[PDB]
A paper describes a structure:
In the presence of the crosslinked heptapeptide (tetra-tri peptide), excellent electron density was seen for mDAP3-d-Ala4−mDAP3. The importance of these two complexes is that the scissile bond in the peptide substrate was seen bound within the active site. The tetra-tri peptide fragment (mDAP3-d-Ala4-mDAP3) mainly interacted with Pgp3 via its two terminal mDAP moieties. Tyr129, Arg195, and Tyr215 of Pgp3 contributed to the binding by forming several hydrogen-bonding networks. The NH1 atom of Arg195 formed a salt bridge with mDAP3 (from the donor strand). The O5 and N1 atoms of the other mDAP3 moiety (from the acceptor strand) formed hydrogen bonds with the backbone nitrogen atoms of Val243 and Ser244. When we superimposed the structure of the H247A variant of Pgp3 in complex with the tetra-tri peptide with that of the WT complex with citrate (closed form), it was clear that the penta- or tetra-tri peptide cannot enter the active site in the closed conformation.
The Pgp3 monomer is structurally divided into four regions: the N-terminal domain (NTD, residues 21–95), a flexible linker (residues 96–147), the LytM domain (residues 148–259), and the C-terminal helix (residues 260–273).
Author numbering: 20 to 274
Amino acid sequence: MELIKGQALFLELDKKDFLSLKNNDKNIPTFAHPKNQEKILAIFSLPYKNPPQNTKLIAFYKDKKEEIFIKTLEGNYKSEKLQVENKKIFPPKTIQERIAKELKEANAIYSSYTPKALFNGAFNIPLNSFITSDFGKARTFNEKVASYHSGTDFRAATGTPIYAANSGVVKIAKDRYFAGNSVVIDHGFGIYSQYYHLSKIDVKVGQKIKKGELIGLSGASGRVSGPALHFGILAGGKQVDPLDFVSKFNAIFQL
Ligand SMILES: [Zn+2]
C-alpha cells in the first residue's frame, strides 16, 4: 500500500481469530467495520515531519501472521524554503513553562484511547465557509521540514459560530499558547477534532457534545494572521489532513 505523509488510512482486516496488530513493538487498536460484520478496522497514520520511508505492520492471528507493507509518499504539499537558519527561538522562561505544561497535558489526552464510538455518523464541517490556508503547507530547511500547517483554516470573521464536527466528549476548553482559545473533542477510537483561535469558548471539559452543537465563536486568539478558524484532526496518534480524513471516515461510517 501507499500513503502520503501526514494522512491516515483505514486498514481492513479479517475479524475471525485476529489477536493483535503491531508496528514494531507498538500495538495498534482495532474497531468494528460498521458495514461488514466479518471485518475490523484500524487507523494507521504517518507523521508529516520525518516519516519512515516504509512501514510493515504484522496482524497476528491465532494460526497465522499477515504482514502489511505501506510505502510513504511525499504528496503534493505546498512548500517554501526557509532562509533564516536560526530556528531555536529563545522564549522567556514564563512562556517556555506554559508551553511545556500545555504540551504534556495535550500529549496525555492524545495518547489516550477511548475504545468505543462517541461519534454519530459522518463528520460535518464545523462551519459552512471555505479554506483559506491548506493543511500541510511546509517551510523547509536542509531539504527537511522545519515546520508545517498541522490543520486547515476556514475563513471566518471574528464572532462566527463554530459547531462540533461530530459528537463526542470535550477534553480541552481553555486558552493555550499557540492554539489560543482551544476546544478539543474526543470522538472515540483515538480520533480528536480541534478548533483553535476562538474568541469565545461555549463548552466545558468533560461535556458531552452533539454533532452540529455550538462549541464557541471564531476569533483570532493566539493568531498573528488575523481572524480564522483552524480545524484539526488527530488520529492514530498524529496530526493528519483533516478534510482527507473526513472524506475517508465518512465513506465508511456515513450510512
Ligand atoms: Zn491553521
